[PDB]
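Progress note, sequence design subtask.
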C-alpha cells in the first residue's frame, strides 16, 4: 500500500479487478507515498506554483526542477490533454506524470478532461507502472467544480481499463485532503 502516513478511506474494485482507493494524507508527506507514478496537474508550461507542484518540487529538490526545466524545452508547451513523464529520483514514486488540464468552461472541456485522465493512464502503462496516484485538481478562477471533476475522472478510469489491452496498473489512488472532497468522491464512486 501507500504506507505510513496514508489512510485508505474507501475502496472499489472494477470489473477487471483494478482497485480504486480513496486515501488521505498531509500534502507534506507526498514524496514518501509508496506509489509508482504520481500525477501532476499543470499548465502548458508545466509550472510548479500550485500546492502539489510545490510539494513535489520540495521533495524532489534540484534534480527534479532540473528534470522539469529540461522537459519544457524537450517537449512542451504541453497541448491540452497531453501528459509527459519526469523521472523522479528522490521520491518513492518512479515517475511524475505531468498533464495539461483544460480550463472549466472551454469547448467540450469535460471530454478533454477525460482524454487527459486517459493520457495519464496511457503514460503510466507505457512505463509499466503497477500503481498511480491522482492528487486533487486545482480550484479557483477557471477550475472544474469538484463534483464534475470527480465524476469525469472516475468515468475516464473505468472506460480506460475497458479499452486498454494488458494494463500493468492494478491500483489507482485518489489523494484527498479535505472532508468535502472526500465526501464527493464517495458519492460518485457509489454510482457503480
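Output:
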Amino acid at each position: 500500500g501507500p504506507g505510513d502516513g496514508f489512510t485508505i478511506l474507501s475502496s472499489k474494485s472494477l470489473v477487471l479487478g483494478q482497485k480504486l482507493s480513496l486515501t488521505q494524507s498531509d500534502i507534506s508527506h507526498i514524496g514518501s507515498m509508496r506509489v509508482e507514478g504520481i500525477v501532476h496537474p499543470t499548465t502548458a508550461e508545466i509550472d510548479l506554483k500550485e500546492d502539489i507542484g510545490k510539494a513535489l518540487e520540495k521533495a524532489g529538490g534540484k534534480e527534479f526542477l532540473e528534470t522539469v526545466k529540461e522537459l519544457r524545452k524537450s517537449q512542451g508547451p504541453l497541448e491540452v490533454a497531453e501528459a509527459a513523464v519526469s523521472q523522479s529520483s528522490g521520491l518513492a514514486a518512479k515517475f511524475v506524470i505531468h498533464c495539461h488540464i483544460p480550463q472549466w468552461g472551454s469547448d467540450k472541456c469535460e471530454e478533454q478532461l477525460e482524454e487527459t485522465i486517459k493520457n495519464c493512464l496511457s503514460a503510466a502503462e507505457d512505463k509499466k507502472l503497477k500503481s498511480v496516484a491522482f492528487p486533487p485538481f486545482p480550484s479557483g478562477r477557471n477550475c472544474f467544480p469538484k463534483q464534475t471533476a470527480a465524476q469525469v475522472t472516475l468515468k475516464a478510469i473505468s472506460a480506460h481499463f475497458d479499452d486498454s489491452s494488458a494494463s500493468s496498473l492494478k491500483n489507482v489512488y485518489f489523494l484527498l485532503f479535505d472532508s468535502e472532497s472526500i465526501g464527493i468522491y464517495v458519492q460518485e464512486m457509489a454510482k457503480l
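The longest helix spans residues 51-74. Work on this subtask will continue into the next period as scheduled.
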